[PDB]
């Protein structure tokens, strides 16, 4: 037939890429599910990322692995492999990881059949090489399209996971107690900082909006890790109102159990944004000149500032641009997020 047989199997899920790009691939993940109901399922991501996954409702054995060198690597591969195939006789390999360290990982598996996409010096050796579509659909749905690619009809899933355990929503709720955060207080959370310059909102414009809401009634959270501390002091420091500090300060378990507890989440392109969709929480998401289009809020309760919305409402309330804010995110408003921010938090 003009399918792949998926139900009934033993199947590996080769994925080694980051926070961002792994939360994206939990969709499809359900939707492999959904026509291999009965299949053996084991996922292989990268030991940092592994808290993402452990606790997953589609998935019957998670594999982790290290890295740092090109030797290091290699033996750790060659091994996870031994490692899977002394557990069961994989019938279906998928590589969704197209570069040369996870193709070769997927080909040393050496199942009956290999799919999915995988670098071109390993293409030869594979069963069909289903390639992913970087131009027509957002990253998670061009990973489900793999799975029609080998036929799968049923896609509909419904948007980005991390199952949370118990422990995690205790750490969670002790340090958010512990800064007298009550049950019913409404919180609204930030996770600004990353490695890119032009994705970084100056930092006393987060300052003000913050200082915004907490002047309300709401309170506030800043996300991050240790090396978004540098990125943060500057905020907090010329807030007039208390915010909670969260930075460097939660594993990524813990942090989703944290994210859960917000009413709302402001943030640039990074990561911690799909965390946050994945845990239900209402998304503000400063995109600069950048198109969310492939990597935005997946399937999500959300609200994109980019810059022609900002030259619109420009011109919209007479209001200009002056050119000191041209480059980079420095055309959105305090005004905009604020906006944006109330109208979420209302239709939630």
Known sequence: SNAMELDYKRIVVTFLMHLGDVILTTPFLEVLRKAAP???????????????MEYNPNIDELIVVDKKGRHNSISGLNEVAREINAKGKTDIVINLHPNERTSYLAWKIHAPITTGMSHFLF?????????????????????INVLEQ?????????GLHIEICEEW???????????GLTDTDILIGFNIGSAVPEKRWPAERFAHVADYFGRLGYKTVFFGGPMDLEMVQPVVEQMETKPIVATGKFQLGPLAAAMNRCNLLITNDSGPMHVGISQGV????????????FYGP???????????????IGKSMKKIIKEGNYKGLSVISEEQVIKAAE??????
Do not use: W
Request: some cysteine; aromatic content about 12%.
């Open 282 to 293: 209402p998304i503000v998401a400063l995109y600069g000149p950048s198109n969310p289009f």
């Open 38 to 52: 009965h299949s053996h399922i084991t996922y292989v991501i990268d030991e940092k990322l592994q808290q993402v």
């Open 298 to 312: 997946y399937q999500a309760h959300a609200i994109v500032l980019e810059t022609m919305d900002s030259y619109e």
């Open 169 to 179: 929503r205790c750490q969670a709720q002790e340090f958010y107690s512990s800064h």
């Open 343 to 348: 109208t979420l938090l209302l239709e939630s």
């Open 123 to 143: 293409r030869p050796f594979m069963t069909k090489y289903t390639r992913l579509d970087r131009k027509t659909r957002h990253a998670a749905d061009m990973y």
């Open 150 to 158: 080998l036929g799968v009809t049923d896609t509909s899933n419904s």
